[PDB]
Ligand binder design. Structure first.
Ligand SMILES: OC[C@H]1O[C@H](O[C@H]2[C@H](O)[C@@H](O)[C@@H](O[C@H]3[C@H](O)[C@@H](O)[C@H](O)O[C@@H]3CO)O[C@@H]2CO)[C@H](O)[C@@H](O)[C@@H]1O
Ligand SMILES: OC[C@H]1O[C@H](O[C@H]2[C@H](O)[C@@H](O)[C@@H](O[C@H]3[C@H](O)[C@@H](O)[C@H](O)O[C@@H]3CO)O[C@@H]2CO)[C@H](O)[C@@H](O)[C@@H]1O
Ligand SMILES: OC[C@H]1O[C@H](O[C@H]2[C@H](O)[C@@H](O)[C@H](O)O[C@@H]2CO)[C@H](O)[C@@H](O)[C@@H]1O
Ligand SMILES: [Ca+2]
Ligand SMILES: [Cl-]
Length: 496
C-alpha cells in the first residue's frame, strides 16, 4: 500500500483543492502530464451535506450523506471522464476518502445535499447508502458529551464524535463493506489510491479490515497485481497518546512533523537554523521515509490553526514558501505532495482567521472554472502554486534525481546550506541576512547548468542564471539575501 503507483519516474502528487473534475481533466492534458507530475489528490468525490451557515464552506465536503459521485466538483460522468483522461496522459488520481463519519449530528433532515439525496442526521438515517442508527458508534462512546473530550484517551478519539460528526461503527462488517464497495467502484473507474481522511479517529485494525477488501488497480493503466496507494491522514506532532507508527501496517502516513518543523526552521523561529537540517528525516524524529507522505502545507493547516499553527508556510508567504518547497522537493525523504490553493479574504482576530471557512472561488455557490493566462498563471483566484516556475521545476528536479543519494552537504553554521543528489542534482540556499558567496562541491559533471529556479533551459541556452561547474565538480554560488528567490538548483537535464 506503500508504492505511490505513479508512472515510473514521476515522484510527486498535487492537491488540486476544490477543483472541478473537468478542470482537472484539462489540467492533466495541458500541464500535469507534460510537466512530469505523478498525480492529483482530489477533494471528496462523494455526496456531502449542503452547509448554508456559513455559505458553502470548503469543509462541508467532509460531511458525507452518501457515496454517490455527485458534488460541486461534478457528477459521475465527469469524474470518470477525468480519471480516464488523466490516466491516459500518465497522471494518477488519488481520492480523499471520508470514511470515519457521515455529516454533523446536529444537521437538519431533508434533501439539502449535493445530489438531492435524503438524510435525517438526528435519527442517523442515510437511505442513499443505506445507513441506519445501528451503523454508528453512539453506544460505544463512553464520554458524557458523546464527543472527544480528551486526546489522551485513544478510545474516545476513535469511538466518539469528532466535532459533532456522526461516527461510523467501523468494527461492523456491514459498515466496512459499504465503505469498501464505494472505494472499489473508484478503483475500477481508474483511481490509483486514497487519502484516508481522519485516520487518527479510526482503529488501525478497522482501516486494515476495509483495505483488505479492495480490488487491485485497473489493468488498462496499471500492471497486474497492483495494490492501491494508501496514505493515512494522521496528525501526530509527537508527545501524545496516539502515534503515527500505529498505522504503518496499512500503508503510508502523513508526516505532519515535516511541515511544522520545516516552517519553524525557514522562518528562523525558536532559535532554529537551516544548518540544523543536515540530518533531516529520521534524524529529526520522523517516521521511516518509506512510510511517509510529506508536504509543506495542506488544506487544513494553510489556514493557520492546524498542525503546525502559525509556523506553517503557505502561498501567503511566497518567498519563504518556495524555499521550503524547494528544500522538500530536493531532499530524498518521503513521497512529496505539493499544495495548490485558492485565495480567500483573511481576517485575523486575536491571532486566528475567522474567515478560514471561505469556500472555493464561486459564482453563487457554483465553483469557478480554472482559467489559464498567457504567462501560465491562473485566473479566478486559483493560486496554482504548482504552476510557479520555482515549484514546477523542482517537481522536475525530483524526477531527474530519483534514486540518487543525499550527498555533498554544506552549511555556513547558520542559514546557508547546500546538498546534492548523487551526481544528478545540486541545490544551494541562502536564508541568512547577508551574502552567500562560496565555491562548493556539487558532485556534478563539469559543464554549464541552467538554474531552474530563476529560469529554464531553452534549446542551447538558459533564460536565467547559469552555473559553471569546474572539471572537479566545484562551482561558485553567489546569492544575495535580497534576491527574490534566494536559492539555486541545477540538475542533469538543465545542463547545456
Ligand atoms: O457539524 C459538524 C462540524 O462541522 C465542521 O467541522 C469541520 C472542520 O471545521 C473542518 O476543519 C473539516 O475537518 C476535516 C479536515 O478537513 C480533514 O483534514 C480531517 O482529516 O477530517 C476532518 C473531518 O473530516 O471539516 C469538518 C466537517 O465539516 C464545523 O467546523 C464544526 O463546528 C461542526 O461541529
Ligand atoms: O532527533 C530527534 C529530535 O530531532 C529534532 O531536533 C532538532 C532540533 O529541533 C534542532 O534545534 C537541532 O538541535 C540543535 C540544537 O538546537 C543545538 O543547541 C545543538 O548544539 O545542536 C543541535 C543539533 O543540530 O537539531 C535537532 C535534530 O538533530 C526534533 O525537532 C525533535 O523534536 C526531536 O526530538
Ligand atoms: O510560472 C509562472 C510564473 O511563476 C512565478 O511567479 C510567482 C511568484 O514566484 C510567486 O511569489 C507569486 O506568489 O506568484 C507568482 C505567480 O502568480 C515566476 O516568478 C514567474 O516568473 C512565472 O511567470
Ligand atoms: Ca471514529
Ligand atoms: Cl492531509
Amino acid at each position: 500500500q506503500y508504492a505511490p503507483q505513479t508512472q515510473s519516474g514521476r515522484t510527486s502528487i498535487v492537491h488540486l483543492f476544490e477543483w472541478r473534475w473537468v478542470d482537472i481533466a484539462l489540467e492533466c492534458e495541458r500541464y500535469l502530464g507534460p510537466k512530469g507530475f505523478g498525480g492529483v489528490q482530489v477533494s471528496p468525490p462523494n455526496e456531502n451535506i449542503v452547509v448554508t451557515n456559513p455559505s458553502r464552506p470548503w469543509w462541508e465536503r467532509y460531511q458525507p450523506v452518501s457515496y454517490k459521485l455527485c458534488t460541486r466538483s461534478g457528477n459521475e460522468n465527469e469524474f470518470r471522464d477525468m480519471v480516464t483522461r488523466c490516466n491516459n496522459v500518465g497522471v494518477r488520481i488519488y481520492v480523499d476518502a471520508v470514511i470515519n463519519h457521515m455529516c454533523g449530528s446536529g444537521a437538519a433532515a431533508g434533501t439539502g445535499t449535493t445530489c438531492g439525496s435524503y438524510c435525517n442526521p438526528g435519527n442517523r438515517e442515510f437511505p442513499a447508502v443505506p445507513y441506519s442508527a445501528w451503523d454508528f458508534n453512539d453506544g460505544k462512546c463512553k464520554t458524557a458529551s458523546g464527543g472527544i473530550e480528551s486526546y489522551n484517551d485513544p478510545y474516545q478519539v476513535r469511538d466518539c464524535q469528532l466535532v459533532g460528526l456522526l461516527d461510523l461503527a467501523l468494527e461492523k462488517d456491514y459498515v466496512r463493506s459499504m465503505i469498501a464497495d464505494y472505494l472499489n467502484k473508484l478503483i475500477d473507474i481508474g483511481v490509483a489510491g486514497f487519502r484516508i481522511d481522519a485516520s487518527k479517529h479510526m482503529w488501525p485494525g478497522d482501516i486494515k479490515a476495509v483495505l483488505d477488501k479492495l480490488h487491485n488497480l485497473n489493468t488498462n493503466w496499471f500492471p497486474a497485481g497492483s495494490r492501491p496507494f494508501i496514505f493515512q491522514e494522521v496528525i501526530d506532532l509527537g508527545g501524545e497518546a496516539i502515534k503515527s507508527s500505529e498505522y504503518f501496517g496499512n500503508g503510508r502516513v502523513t508526516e505532519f512533523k515535516y511541515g511544522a518543523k520545516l516552517g519553524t526552521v525557514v522562518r528562523k523561529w525558536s532559535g532554529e537554523k537551516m544548518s540544523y537540517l543536515k540530518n533531516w528525516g529520521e534524524g529529526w524524529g520522523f517516521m521511516p521515509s518509506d512510510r511517509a507522505l510529506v508536504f509543506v502545507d495542506n488544506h487544513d493547516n494553510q489556514r493557520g490553526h492546524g498542525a503546525g499553527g502559525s509556523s506553517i508556510l503557505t502561498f501567503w508567504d511566497a518567498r519563504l514558501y518556495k524555499i521550503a518547497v524547494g528544500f522538500m522537493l530536493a531532499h530524498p525523504y518521503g513521497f512529496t505532495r505539493v499544495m495548490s490553493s485558492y485565495r480567500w479574504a483573511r481576517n485575523f482576530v486575536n491571532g486566528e482567521d475567522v474567515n478560514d471557512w471561505i469556500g472555493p472561488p464561486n459564482n453563487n455557490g457554483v465553483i469557478k472554472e480554472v482559467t489559464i493566462n498567457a504567462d501560465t498563471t491562473c485566473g479566478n483566484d486559483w493560486v496554482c502554486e504548482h504552476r510557479w516556475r520555482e515549484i514546477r521545476n523542482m517537481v522536475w528536479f525530483r524526477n531527474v534525481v530519483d534514486g540518487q543519494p543525499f550527498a555533498n552537504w554544506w552549511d555556513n553554521g547558520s542559514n546557508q546550506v547546500a546538498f546534492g543528489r548523487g551526481n544528478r542534482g545540486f541545490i544551494v540556499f541562502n536564508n541568512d541576512d547577508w551574502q552567500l558567496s562560496s565555491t562548493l562541491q556539487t558532485g556534478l559533471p563539469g559543464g554549464t547548468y541552467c538554474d531552474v529556479i530563476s529560469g529554464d533551459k531553452v534549446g542551447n541556452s538558459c533564460t536565467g542564471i547559469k552555473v559553471y561547474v569546474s572539471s572537479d565538480g566545484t562551482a561558485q554560488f553567489s546569492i544575495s539575501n535580497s534576491a527574490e528567490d534566494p536559492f539555486i538548483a541545477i540538475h542533469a537535464e538543465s545542463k547545456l
